[PDB]
Copies of this chain bind each other. A is one copy, B any other.
Amino acid sequence: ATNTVYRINDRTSHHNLVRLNEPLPSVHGHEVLVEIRGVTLNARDIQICGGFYPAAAVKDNLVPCSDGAGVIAAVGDAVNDLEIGDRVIINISFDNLYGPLKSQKYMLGGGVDGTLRQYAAVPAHAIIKVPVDCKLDYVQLASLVCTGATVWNALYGYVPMKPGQTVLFQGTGGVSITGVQLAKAAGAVTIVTSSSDEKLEFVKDKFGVDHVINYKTTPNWAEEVRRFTNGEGADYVIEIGGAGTIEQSIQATASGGMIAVIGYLADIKQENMPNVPLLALIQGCALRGVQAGSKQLTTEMVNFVSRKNVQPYIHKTFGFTENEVMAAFDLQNSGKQIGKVGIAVKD
């Protein structure tokens, strides 16, 4: 019995992942062995494998990817409430069960080995049980670990969204696509921005978002957000531009609204760095640095997704052979994808 894993040691490109056959891991008494069946990628995996993840330290001989779902294949001798065959997701963190994330030491695919392998030994306390009536496949289930957890934290982990409020999503990446599908099933009005009109059309057609705005051709986007919200502005902004876009974002937000700061993909120079304390003081709105999401939160969002039959959107699902895995990573890097890229470890 073999565990086929991918590991990287030279973090200058995902093309330094090496397919290895290892012995089946034994579990410690408090662990469970997960047969991984579905995985999805994140920008984080590209940043880590390519050596531009400044948030935290990354281990040597790393198995990448935070996102995995599958079934229990073995159970340690102290473990109570998990059986072989049980269908599961792994929490993005081993240790962040509730409250704020205190480090990245135990984050899958970074501080500890991630999900791009057939088998993983993990602490049972990291396990999220997939409700029994859930009809999603394993890749869809995996999709919830990083983007689902993050979005639910931004919308429900500090001051919670109310039905009827407006959420603005920057770009058409995994955070936004996962976000629009959850927010729309929670009764939000949704707005999405993009550098591409083709993408905006696609997002509008598949997900039924209420308004689209091209931020490349229409950099005065705050003003449009205001037109579509009766002059009030958006109640939540899922902010992935960082300083480069924070001025527009602030002016697009209602007073009393929330800007969930999540990424910083946008360019900025010191000369144009906006005065954020002053802008936020004038708008009367909040900013919050969002850091994934705890197990408690993520479980609620999982329960919602199952109970209401939200069907996470998967752009393309690849197999587990080397050429397939690189084609999936390549697609994640290109920026041409809408939402999630998936990998079927089994089928």
Contact surface of A with B, Cβ cutoff 8 Å? 54-55, 99-102, 158-159, 239, 242-243, 246, 254-256, 261-264, 268, 270-271, 273-278, 280-291
Q: How far is the CB of A52 from chain B (nearest CB, A)?
A: 14
Q: Which of B99, B254, B264, B278 contacts A281 (CB 8 A)?
A: B264
Instruction: Say yes or no: B289 contacts A280, CB within 8 Å.
Output: yes
Q: Which B residues are CB-close (under 8 A) to A55?
A: 282
**What's the least CB distance linking A197 to chain B, in Å?**
27
What is the CA–CA distance of A209 and B280 in the complex, to the nearest angstrom?
Answer: 29
19 interchain pairs, CB-CB under 8 A: A54-B278, A54-B282, A100-B255, A100-B284, A101-B284, A242-B275, A242-B277, A243-B278, A246-B277, A261-B277, A261-B281, A262-B281, A268-B275, A270-B273, A276-B287, A277-B289, A280-B289, A283-B289, A286-B287
CB atoms of A261 and B288 under 8 A apart: no
Chain B residues with CB under 8 Å of A284's CB are: 100-101, 289-291
4 tightest CB-CB pairs across the interface, nearest first? A100-B256, A280-B289, A276-B276, A281-B289
Q: Which of A100, A281, A285 has the most CB of B within 10 A?
A: A281
Complex contacts, A100 vs chain B, CB 8 Å: 254-256, 284
* Residue of A261, A274, A277 ringed by the most chain B CB atoms within 10 A: A277
How many identical chains are in the complex?
Answer: 2
Taking A273-B273, A280-B287 as known contacts, 15 extra A-B pairs with beta carbons closer than 8 A to each other, sorted by chain A number, are A54-B282, A99-B256, A100-B254, A243-B277, A255-B291, A263-B281, A264-B275, A264-B278, A264-B281, A268-B275, A270-B270, A283-B289, A284-B289, A285-B289, A286-B289
Chain B residue nearest in CB terms to A263: B281
| B residues less than 8 Å from A246 (CB atoms) | 276-277
Distance between A103 CB and nearest chain B CB, rounded to angstroms? 10
Least CB distance, A105 to chain B, in whole angstroms: 14
| Cα(A161)–Cα(B223), bound, Å | 35
| CB nearest to A261 among chain B residues | B277
